[PDB]
């Protein structure tokens, strides 16, 4: 009974694909490369709803000319099971059928096929088709073709990562990134930089990742998703190194820029890293994020870790670490947690500084459960130099005195903040006025 | 002006028994057993034994099930007689009686289904609201949060469609009790104050208990001016409090800044709230918030203060006040800093201009984030 | 009760008396406008669904 529903679903999917290729052709004809992004938008939904009949009919109807790619593609696809009501979907008519299809359209269809092959647990042929597509893209040179090649790069890297051959694709990615940078392609630059950072971080080549980040300038006109990926990876690098403040800033920006509804796993990962880096810095993460339905069960070990850090107790911390030791390793924060396990006292010193305007070193030792006040003095001096606490020590009497709070308003800082925001708003208005189209003269 | 069904004192007694301290309360056990004996609650007795690991007095339960079956068959026969000839009215009353007895015996699901069928047949808005109130009271008795929320929304929709203001005020009291349950003390105090002069829901609690609850919620939800104009200067509240020396002392200690007496009153109120079933979940949050409120009230009129003076005012030691102030300043509640070498409590209340600048930065950053996201999404 | 604008300095046995413009009435209006325009941007978000 569901066969008829599947067939009508396939027909509507074919209509959607035809609309997509029409949009690509319109983009190429009108010299408006950004149009192809409209078709590329529905890539996840189309991948979800793809089927054998859909792919076979699409390729047959869209590869009348240049049948070499049909020869390379069809064998991977499965023949329809004795189809008798075939309508012989023929989108290209007469002159259109005779003429060779466009490079962007061929790339899009190849991309659909590789995505389907990947979704199915058959990665070898996915890699083969991907390599063929990449050869085609390298041979060609166009703008809309580059826009499609961005997603092609993403899925090529994905299939190789599934294969566990991420290292070999590194040189391929570097070469393509160089070509894109020479050709001034922001989308390709962003996608390739994100994929390269992922490659490095997979094998823990943090020095290489840092060098590439320092020497490459991320495109400003990049999609919010690419910005989120880049911010997350840079924050990961800075957190693995000792740049906790910058890591927290960048990763808050990444979580802010991530899509609101989807990207649940990315949100969980960024949230865990943010919790750990905040604990290292000595603050206390907000508790609202610990009860969201999506991020509820995942962050429980980190909830317990925050509990122990706040009520600093090495017994509880070690218990939590021993219990959830393996999950920290799986999620990629065990080393940072190990650092926290020894810099825990920083949080206590921060709370003491926040509460007390002037306290004795003996009292600080008593509150921090330390040994003789010499250790407390050394810890406080370390914190002051690190900038965690704005206080000055005075041993001629033997107390730590917190610095005064300066009147920020009388300073020029509000002027700078407001100027930044004014410039941002003016740029937004200018670009929103330039985005307008008046089409009747077409 | 509504039936005492389900009897919420039963829920109170069950909670008292569930509490570890009073699980051996012979008197409470006798009172609960007497109530269940009189009302013939076989499902509730079964559930209570299952939950408390109590021996089943099968001798009583036998006759009790006998009476329950007798009454149920009577009600079914009367319903059948009604539907045979009588048109409406009598059949609705039959279903109401059946469901009421089922609730009185304790069958949650049977009672809920009976009330749903009765509501489906009923067309009078008053009777519909009465059914919704019965369901809301069952949800309160069994702390069924989803049922409570759904029935509250249904009652609100009915009142919007049109209904008596008496039922409106009753719904206000019900909403207030639910708000106290889910820790929305601001709305609880608002509704209780609005209904202090229009209280007709004696089905849920006594008027003295209602005024005590209103006082408790008000002193935590209302600033000093509102507490002055509404609670302390409230004629009805004062009239009722005239018979409650403890609650009057608790309120007036805070109002008049007699802090030792206020701390004593909060100490007794903590035990009262912990024993009370509605407040028991939030019996520490309320105490902590009241302590923070008292400390902030004392500090609101002092640039500098001495820990010895604070300890004398609160009738405590210096170390206790030091711990409390440190904890609350760290949590960010009290605006002050503690100087220990010289025991001073210098106040650090923020400047309005600077607070406004920070708030503007934060809110404008959120808005600009959203505007940038919209601009980006417009083209992609 | 805000009868007079002043603050007590215990220990030193002093009473400080000052005059304060506690509020600007421009920052508050700006904040309210920011909230209202946040609502407007939410409505624009809803309206942009037609573009998709």
């Amino acid at each position: 009974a569901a066969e008829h529903s599947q067939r009508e679903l396939d027909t509507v999917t074919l209509e959607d694909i035809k609309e997509h290729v029409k949009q690509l052709e319109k983009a190429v004809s009108g010299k408006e490369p950004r149009f192809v992004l409209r078709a590329l938008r529905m890539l996840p939904s189309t991948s979800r709803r793809l089927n054998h009949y859909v792919l076979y009919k699409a390729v047959q109807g869209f590869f009348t000319s240049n049948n070499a790619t049909r020869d390379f593609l069809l064998p991977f696809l499965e023949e329809p099971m004795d189809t008798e009501a075939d309508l012989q979907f023929r989108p290209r008519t007469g002159k259109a059928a005779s003429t060779p299809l466009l490079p962007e359209v061929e790339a899009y269809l190849q991309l659909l096929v590789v995505i389907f092959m990947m979704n199915s647990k058959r990665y070898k042929e996915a890699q083969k088709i991907s390599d063929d597509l990449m050869q085609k893209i390298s041979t060609q040179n166009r703008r809309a073709l580059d826009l499609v090649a961005a997603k092609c790069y993403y899925y090529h890297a994905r299939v190789y990562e599934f294969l566990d051959k991420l290292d070999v694709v590194r040189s391929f990615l570097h070469a393509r990134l160089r070509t894109a940078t020479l050709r001034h392609d922001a989308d390709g630059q962003a996608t390739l930089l994100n994929l390269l950072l992922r490659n490095y971080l997979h094998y823990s080549l943090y020095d290489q990742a840092e060098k590439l980040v320092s020497k490459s300038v991320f495109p400003e006109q990049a999609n919010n998703n690419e910005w989120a990926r880049y911010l997350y990876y840079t924050g990961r690098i800075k957190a693995i190194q000792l740049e906790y403040s910058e890591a927290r800033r960048t990763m808050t920006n990444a979580l802010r820029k991530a899509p609101q509804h989807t990207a649940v796993g990315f949100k969980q990962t960024v949230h865990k890293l943010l919790i750990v880096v905040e604990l290292l810095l000595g603050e206390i993460p907000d508790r609202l994020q610990f009860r969201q339905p999506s991020l509820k069960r995942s962050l429980m070990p980190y909830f317990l870790l925050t509990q122990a850090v706040r009520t600093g107790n090495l017994a509880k911390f070690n218990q939590v670490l021993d219990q959830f030791g393996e999950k920290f390793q799986a999620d990629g924060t065990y080393t940072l947690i190990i650092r926290l396990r020894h810099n825990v006292i920083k949080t206590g010193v921060r709370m003491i500084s926040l509460s007390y305007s002037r306290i004795s070193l003996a009292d600080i030792a008593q509150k921090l459960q330390l040994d003789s006040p010499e250790d407390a003095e050394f810890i406080v001096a370390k914190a002051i130099r690190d900038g965690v606490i704005e206080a000055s020590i005075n041993h001629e009497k033997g107390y730590v005195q917190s610095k005064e709070m300066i009147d920020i308003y009388s300073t020029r800082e509000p002027q700078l903040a407001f100027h930044q925001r004014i410039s941002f708003c003016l740029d937004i208005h200018n670009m929103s006025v330039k985005a307008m189209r008046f089409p009747p003269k077409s | 002006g509504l039936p005492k069904n389900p009897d919420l004192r039963i829920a109170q007694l069950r909670f008292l028994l569930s509490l570890p301290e009073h699980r051996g309360d012979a008197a409470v056990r006798d009172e609960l057993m007497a109530a269940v004996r009189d009302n013939n609650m076989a499902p509730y007795y079964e559930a209570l034994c299952k939950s408390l690991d109590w021996q089943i007095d099968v001798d009583l339960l036998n006759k009790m099930k006998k009476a329950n079956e007798d009454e149920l068959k009577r009600l079914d026969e009367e319903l059948e007689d009604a539907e045979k000839n009588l048109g409406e009215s009598e059949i609705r009353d039959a279903m109401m009686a059946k469901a009421e007895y089922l609730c009185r015996i304790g069958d949650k699901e049977g009672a809920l289904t009976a009330f749903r069928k009765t509501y489906d047949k009923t067309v009078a808005l008053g009777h519909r609201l009465d059914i919704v109130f019965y369901l809301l009271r069952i949800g309160l008795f069994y702390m069924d949060n989803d049922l409570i929320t759904r029935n509250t929304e249904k009652a609100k929709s009915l009142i919007e469609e049109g209904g008596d203001w008496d039922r409106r005020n009753r719904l206000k009291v019900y909403q207030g009790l639910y708000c106290v349950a889910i820790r929305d003390f601001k709305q609880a105090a608002e509704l209780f104050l609005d209904t202090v002069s229009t209280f007709t829901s004696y089905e849920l609690m006594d008027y003295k208990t209602f005024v005590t609850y209103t006082v408790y919620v008000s002193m935590i939800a209302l600033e000093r001016p509102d507490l002055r104009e509404k609670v302390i200067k409230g004629a009805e509240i004062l009239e009722v409090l005239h018979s409650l020396p403890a609650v009057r002392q608790y309120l007036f200690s805070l109002y008049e800044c007699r802090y030792s007496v206020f701390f004593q009153s909060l100490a007794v109120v903590e035990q009262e709230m912990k024993k009370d079933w509605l407040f028991a979940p939030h019996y520490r949050y309320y105490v902590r918030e009241m302590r923070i409120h008292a400390y902030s009230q004392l500090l609101e009129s002092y640039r500098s203060l001495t820990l010895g003076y604070m300890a004398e005012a609160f009738g405590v030691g210096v170390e206790f006040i030091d711990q409390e102030l440190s904890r609350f300043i760290a949590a960010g509640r009290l605006h002050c800093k503690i100087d220990k070498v010289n025991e001073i409590v210098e106040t650090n209340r923020p400047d309005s201009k600077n607070w406004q600048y920070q708030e503007t930065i934060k809110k404008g950053d959120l808005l600009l984030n959203r505007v940038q996201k919209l601009s980006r999404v417009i083209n992609m | 009760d805000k009868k007079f604008h002043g603050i007590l300095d215990q220990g030193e046995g002093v009473l400080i008396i000052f005059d304060e413009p506690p509020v600007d009435k421009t920052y508050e209006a700006a904040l309210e406008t920011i909230q209202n325009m946040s609502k407007v941007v939410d409505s624009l978000y809803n309206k942009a669904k037609k573009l998709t």
Partner: peptide, 30 residues
């Protein structure tokens, strides 16, 4: 800054309206 924010929101509103109009016109012509 508040004035500039108002200006930006108005510009976004105009862009959304223009895009709606163009998309509707293209759909009708198609």
């Amino acid at each position: 800054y508040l004035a500039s924010l108002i200006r930006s929101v108005v510009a976004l509103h105009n862009l959304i309206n223009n895009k709606i109009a163009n998309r509707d016109a293209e759909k009708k012509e198609g």
